[PDB]
């Protein structure tokens, strides 16, 4: 519980920011059959043009005022077109003799968006919300989106919206305003007014994730993120309990305390459960790779390219699940048992630290040969999939930045998922189907097995000859689960947005759906 | 106070000699147009040869013994040559038919800037080596104005004294010096010695190792300067420090067994003060990298105990400074003293510290914590309520590809106080070069969550890139900022310069 | 004259766009006293907000309509920020019941803007120039400009509006200015498109591939500029180049396909000849490192056809230079044009070879090729018996390290001659920093076999020991160097700066 400290300036704990501005907003649906009202902050049409690439615009909406109807004309809209991402703000006054700004994104010629093109979407709104005070905004569909998609809108909507200034001090933004209301027009609205605030909740569950993420070292520590953690629990009414060191040790976690020893943070094991009221029929562990800060060890990442100050990055697994702990939590469903797991320490340099060549004992009484320090996600990943399973569950699924190799095999926009289930592994792309969060399926090879051969051990950590990180990773990971349905995503590649210079949040909605799914 | 050790053969003090042989020789300088008197130990004539390519060696000066005077004849001396460098040796017997000895430097044929001088010297001081003499005795026949005869004095002094602290398993006592208009020369002398001092004093600093200097006996020894030179003192430490919120500086610190130790000396003229100076300096008494480890090659780890070259021009500056007396001013001398180090309490990559005039730094590489203990070394300065800020420091590699070895670089927000640093580098003879702050670069210090980033991701001008992240750290305070990191370290000798007492102090007595 | 080809599909020529939409605009420079007009097309008001860091929008202009007017109002505009190079623009009715878009563009809290200032301000307005389909541009100056900003303002706009095309398989017709004292800047503008086209050329030329922009086309590309400016024109081939034995030079280009090309094209004014300059630009086609093979990470040898930059503004600057016709003036345009490759004909890494003025020379590696085509570019630059002579190259990968991606470096042996490049670097508002060359490190270039050393295996600041290295071929005459390596190419928009065209020009001029 107590934050250990080098100085006094040290942070003790994790800022957390459970009321956003996004929260405060009031989302109300209408139909688009009974026309659009158009009388304050900025009204913004989604229009795309089936068949003609960078086709004209044509707004088909009904529009309740004369003035603003006479002003989105076909003829005086033509000049504009749909290309996607494309945008523009007009200016006008109203029949009431008050001005408005109204506008158009535009969503292409492909009457049907994938999650890439919905996103491109959202962003371009969003740069129409900053460096304008808004108090309202508007937003007519004018394309076809199903209950997924519209969610996924939204959510996506929230989130970039959302600004973290937790570590701001004198660079504060001086003109962040947010607006207070968000109007939506839609087709059969009274279908769509439930994924308002499931739509919210997901927002949270990623945005959460995303600040435990950006979070650096120094803040999110062992200690202070399993703090983190117990608060977080301690508001949903989830049981929760926080394994110490000494627990761990009783235990036998050898593997997951070996990675720890260098680190100046005792090591904590988080563990959260959440029960349905009445019959349990699906008993589900996730487990997160909880690694605060990943420096390499005496494997120091100093090569060229290891990019040593990203590895702040490397408890996103950890992050995504309790982010689905908020969401399950949060929207409560029946007839499951869920734990949330996280074997969380830090991987350092020190005379404490455990050494490449180190033989150490899991706690399933395998020993384990170390071949590099660096690889450390998967020895504490070992120790928590063995608890796992003692928990006696149906599924177990670990989501871990754990592998490199992802970025040379699917890159930044979807994660891997491996598993010795195909059920299991079918219900994972099914919800990343329906989170829209993007996930391929990888196999586990069986060949390579054979390189994690010890000659002194039981088992090697790594590979000297498989180049096949991502699934050399898998098989050992393979080795913990005695007979269990289970599924692994490798999350390395997608979790942080380069492009963006900030955290995805990604897994919370996939991991949720999975849930819920079920 | 303390130094802490890990073993009881650790040290806990930096050696350090106060009282060198170069302090017990007695000088003396004469008017050549009086005539020399070669007589004992070994006289040195230093000649040119204007113009004339490679010309002879001749002899202009007139000597009272009318052997010497034979042996140095136009006849005898034309099959020697003036060649920059070069030098002979002569023997022979004078009037009183005692043996003497005899020579010269050649000077080369241009009427000389700071590196020839050098080149002149260390031709002199081999001469001086492997040669037990009680006296050397030189003949100016080429031209010096005061400013580079009191260069010639500090540079034969330096380049003459051998650091001898660290060795386990006959120097002069009489210079004599013949020069025209001698009278106008002689003021020069004992500010050289002075000079001379403060530049060894600031070499010992840095050559002494890591193990023996450390933030703790650094900064003892600080005290023990200060103390002798009447200066008034005050050694902030880890509780001030926290109390100060020194986070940017307490954070590259976290990492070693040694506290940090922040130096601040101050001198204060007697009178009217019309001048108030903060000189501070770069102390990183060892720089491993941190997290961000100096592995790759060409990083040169080893040499890394000269990464407090900027304390250590500050603190000769103190001694040049607290024994010259000059009027007028008020001197304030800042170190942030720390090292940095890997270890499991070490700042990481990627960490958010605060620093003590509330800005948020966003940490990019742990190898470039300089810029981190100048920024609260600098709100420290400018809160003292001072004229001007020079700063000094081995701060980026980058310089070796810029200026090289011989020329620091000067960095400012000030074009007065940028010309003053230029001024003084010619009358200290220590070549600085004005570089431009590039505004232009200062958007990829935005950090996404901080209110800065320590380091630019995509800019590859390093010196520029530290210089804009440090005028973040001054508000309104004429400020300049000189790079030592090139020009610090003689590679060719293996051993410091003592870069920059000379001009610092030349600074503080021109204003 | 004749391009080799290996294969018949191989290009034979550079394909070069004269005549540009830019040419096409008509300028028209209004008073700001008055008020302004806001009929068609996009208005564009320069705004900023002295003092008051991302402070609110004001218009102070008054404007000739009063829908446009109503949208101006201060209880309007403030809902933005003046955030250097932010902007919004809107779509609105005016007076008239036409549609015209009127916006801004921040120009943040500082009165008087830089070089880099004003060009991210003309990026964020060429951004609403490529999404709009648009007739005029009216830009309203709210903010202080100098003649010279004005000009170079107009010259940005044009050149970061116009596309590149030529490699692929609608414009606006007017530009208006609002200004006050708009009569003192009227005469800027015929200058601005002058000059923009000399840099366009100049980026032209860069960006073309070297498959096309090789040493025979791009003299090639040379006589057909000379021809058309009635600028003399000599091209010296590998026959008269071997007779003024060039070895430093010709060396270089052995290991090429294409034949060495020597450039020479001169102005000169029809009255009296005060002065005579030579302007001296690096011109290889492509550097492979040749044996010492660009292959380090990070050497960016897909980069390398860029390494004509200093070639490309010296025939940008003739272009300029033979428009607006100089008077009192001779000027030589020079470049010692070649191809650094690797075969089994190459020059190798301890080659020792001899400079036209007989100086012996040891390769020490021919990633290094520069200073060597320089070095006989420099002696043939003085025995024409100039004033001065002033050579622009991509020279030293150091430069990223000491100045970056703004500013050149310049050398040079004559403090009168780097205060007239000084000067020119103001007016033109190219950046330029002066450097010194430090004769310490001269001895480092002091061969044991030849007369001296290309490189040095010892001092790392190569900048500076290039030219010391140049030095040593100009023997009596006032000589500059302008490195240009860190500043030719606009990394982040991915295509040439055209650098150094308006900077020598200025020098011609004033
Ligand atoms: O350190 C790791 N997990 O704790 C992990 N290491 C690996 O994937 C490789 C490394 C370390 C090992 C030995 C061998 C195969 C395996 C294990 C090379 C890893 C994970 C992510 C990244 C990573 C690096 C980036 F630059 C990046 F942009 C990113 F998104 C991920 C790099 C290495
Ligand atoms: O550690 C440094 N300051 O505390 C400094 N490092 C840097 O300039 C690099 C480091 C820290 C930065 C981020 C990135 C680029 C820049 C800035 C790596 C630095 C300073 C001197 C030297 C240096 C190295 C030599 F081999 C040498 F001979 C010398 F004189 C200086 C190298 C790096
Ligand atoms: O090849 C060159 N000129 O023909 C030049 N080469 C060098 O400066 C190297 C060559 C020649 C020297 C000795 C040693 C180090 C230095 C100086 C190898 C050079 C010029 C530009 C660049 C360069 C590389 C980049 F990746 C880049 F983005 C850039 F802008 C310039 C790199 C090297
Ligand atoms: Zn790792
Ligand atoms: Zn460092
Ligand atoms: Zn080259």
């Known amino acids: 519980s107590e934050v250990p ?14 009321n956003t501005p996004i929260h405060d907003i009031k989302v109300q649906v209408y139909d688009i059959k009974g026309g659009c009202n158009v009388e304050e902050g900025l009204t913004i049409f989604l229009v795309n043009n089936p068949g003609k690439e960078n086709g004209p615009v044509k707004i088909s909406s009904k529009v309740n005022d004369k003035q603003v109807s006479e002003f989105l004309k076909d003829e005086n809209m033509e000049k504009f077109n749909v ?83 937790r570590f701001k001090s004198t660079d504060k933004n001086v003109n962040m305003e947010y607006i207070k209301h968000l109007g939506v027009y839609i087709n059969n609205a009274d279908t769509y007014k439930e994924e308002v605030e499931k739509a919210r909740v997901y927002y949270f569950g990623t945005y959460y994730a995303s600040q435990l993420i950006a979070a650096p070292s120094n803040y999110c520590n062992p200690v202070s993120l399993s703090n983190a953690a117990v608060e977080l629990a301690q508001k949903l009414n989830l049981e929760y309990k926080i394994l110490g060191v000494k627990e761990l040790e009783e235990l036998k976690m050898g593997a997951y305390l070996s990675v720890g020893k260098g680190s100046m943070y005792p090591n904590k094991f988080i563990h959260l459960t959440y029960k349905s009221k ?63 797991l996280s074997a969380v320490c830090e991987n350092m340099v020190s005379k404490n630290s455990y050494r490449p060549g ?46 490199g190799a992802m970025l040379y095999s699917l890159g930044t926009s979807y994660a891997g998922v491996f598993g010795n289930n195909e059920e299991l592994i079918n219900k994972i792309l099914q919800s990343s189907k329906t989170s829209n969060e993007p996930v391929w ?32 990773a898998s098989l050992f990971l393979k080795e ?32 949720t759906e999975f849930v819920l799914n079920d």
């Open 358 to 403: 180190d033989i150490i004992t899991a706690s399933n009484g395998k020993t384990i040969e170390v071949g590099n320090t660096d690889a450390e996600g998967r020895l504490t990943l070992a120790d928590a999939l063995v608890y796992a399973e003692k928990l006696g569950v149906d599924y177990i699924v670990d989501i871990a930045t754990l592998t």
């Open 5 to 18: 400290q080098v100085v006094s300036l040290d942070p003790t704990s994790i800022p957390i920011e459970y």
């Open 278 to 340: 009445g019959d349990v029929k699906k008993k589900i562990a996730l487990v997160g790779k909880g690694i605060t800060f990943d420096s390499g060890g005496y494997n120091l990442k100093a090569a060229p390219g290891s990019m040593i100050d990203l590895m702040k990055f490397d408890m996103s697994g950890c992050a995504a699940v309790l982010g689905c702990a908020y969401c399950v939590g949060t929207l409560k469903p029946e007839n499951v048992e869920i734990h949330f």
């Open 83 to 165: 290309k996607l991402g494309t945008s523009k703000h007009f200016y006008m006054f109203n029949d009431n003799k008050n001005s408005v700004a109204v506008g158009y994104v535009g969503c292409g010629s492909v009457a049907d968006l994938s999650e890439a093109d919905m996103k491109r979407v959202v962003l371009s709104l969003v740069t129409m919300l900053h460096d304008n005070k808004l108090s309202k905004l508007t937003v007519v569909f004018e394309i076809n989106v199903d209950k997924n998609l519209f969610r996924f809108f939204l959510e996506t909507l929230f989130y970039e919206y959302m600004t973290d200034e």
């Open 441 to 472: 399926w990888l196999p586990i090879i069986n060949e390579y097995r054979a390189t994690l051969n010890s000659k002194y051990a039981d088992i090697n950590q790594i590979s000297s000859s498989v180049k096949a990180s991502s699934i050399v």
């Open 480 to 511: 913990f689960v005695q007979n269990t349905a289970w599924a692994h995503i490798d999350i390395a590649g997608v979790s942080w947005n380069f492009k963006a210079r900030k955290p995805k949040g990604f897994g919370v909605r996939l991991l």
